[PDB]
From a paper:
Mouse ALKBH1 protein has 389 residues and consists of an N-terminal extension (NTE), a nucleotide-recognition lid (NRL), and a C-terminal double-stranded β helix (DSBH) domain. By establishing a reliable in vitro enzymatic assay, we demonstrated that ALKBH1 prefers bubbled and bulged DNAs, instead of ssDNA or dsDNA substrates.
The extra α1 helix forms extensive hydrophobic contacts with the minor sheet involving residues F23, L26, F27, Y30 of α1, I230 of β(II), P290 of β(VII), and I253, L255 of β(IV), and sequence alignment shows that these residues are highly conserved in vertebrates. The α1 helix is critical to maintain the structural integrity of the active center; in particular, F23 and F27 directly stabilize the minor β sheet through extensive hydrophobic contacts. Furthermore, enzymatic assays showed that ALKBH1Δα1 was totally inactive in N6-mA demethylation. Although an α1-truncated human ALKBH1 protein was reported to have demethylation activities towards m1rA in tRNA,8 we performed in vitro enzymatic assay using the α1-truncated human ALKBH1 and hardly detected any activities towards m1rA in tRNA stem loop nor N6-mA in DNA bubble, further underlying the importance of α1 helix.
Author numbering: 38 to 48, 58 to 231, 237 to 348
Write the structure that this text describes.
């Protein structure tokens, strides 16, 4: 029995299957409010043998991925949050993250023989309920507000996947660079939502039989994985970043600018030229992941 090829959901291996989305559960205007295409235009796939596994290739409107990258790099990394930098940086010091990256970016010396910027040292950010790894339950403290626009995005994707009533309550944002270390880390009826932006990576989905080789698949910028039940047990972080293709610094979906006119109720905001320079420079060698979970009931 041979080793399968890497599945590319964007074009020896378990059978790929269309997943039917509840296309009338999210209005066309609401999907655009957070930068998503209308659900009817989305593709979604399952895998035979893996109930609870959903894969949604890049369902984002052109240029709207930029809004979600900038939120992860520039806004969600700011207090109030819990952060890997809190080990060494004071809360006041972390407030200078964005201006520092712009300073590194404006320098004419291009070199890695220098201190790493805070953005380059960013590895994880948690929002909402804090998950205490010792206790292996959620904590009563280290609580930070869950950003509402990410909750609106999470709730819509969960609804279209058949999980109406889902509440975004615990988020973790992971930042992986080419030099990231390759480490590895209740009820699971409710889904967790996993978003990817930037460079590509390979998700290894655990074998069904014991000692079986995992099923491989590409995570492209904008891809969303919805996982619950049997398949939520199989979710894990992907710290390995694939280097960008020869000649192509960023995927084409990250090279489309945002619309000039957005709606006036939209949560997608404009992204300035200098702000996108920081995102584009960073994402040249990085992938950002967003994981959203429900906590209460």
């Amino acid at each position: 029995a041979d080793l399968g090829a890497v599945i590319d959901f964007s074009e020896g291996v378990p059978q790929v299957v269309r997943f039917p989305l509840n296309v009338s559960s999210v209005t066309e205007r609401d999907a655009e409010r957070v930068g998503l295409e209308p659900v009817s235009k989305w593709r979604a796939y399952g895998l035979e043998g893996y109930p609870g596994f959903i894969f949604i290739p890049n369902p984002f409107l052109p240029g709207c991925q930029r809004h979600w990258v900038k939120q992860c790099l520039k806004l969600y990394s700011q207090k109030p949050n819990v952060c890997n930098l809190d080990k060494h940086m004071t809360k006041e010091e972390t407030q200078g993250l964005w201006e520092q990256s712009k300073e590194v970016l404006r320098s004419k010396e291009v070199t890695k023989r220098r201190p790493r910027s805070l953005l380059e040292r960013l590895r994880w950010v948690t929002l909402g309920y804090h998950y205490n790894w010792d206790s292996k339950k959620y904590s009563a403290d280290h609580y930070t507000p869950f950003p509402s626009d990410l909750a609106f995005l999470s709730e819509q994707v969960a609804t279209a996947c058949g999980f109406q009533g889902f509440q975004a309550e615990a988020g973790i944002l992971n930042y992986y660079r080419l030099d990231s270390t390759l480490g590895i880390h209740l009820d699971h009826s409710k889904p967790l939502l996993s978003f990817s932006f930037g460079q590509s990576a390979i998700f290894l989905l655990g074998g069904l039989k014991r000692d079986e080789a995992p099923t491989a698949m590409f995570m492209h910028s904008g891809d969303i994985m919805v996982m619950s039940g049997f398949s939520r047990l199989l979710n894990h972080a992907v710290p390995r970043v694939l280097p960008h293709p020869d000649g192509e610094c960023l995927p084409h979906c990250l090279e489309t600018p945002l619309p000039a006119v957005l709606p006036s109720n939209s949560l997608v905001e404009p992204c300035s030229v200098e702000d996108w320079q920081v995102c584009a420079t960073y994402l040249r060698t990085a992938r950002v992941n967003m994981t959203v979970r429900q906590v209460l009931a």
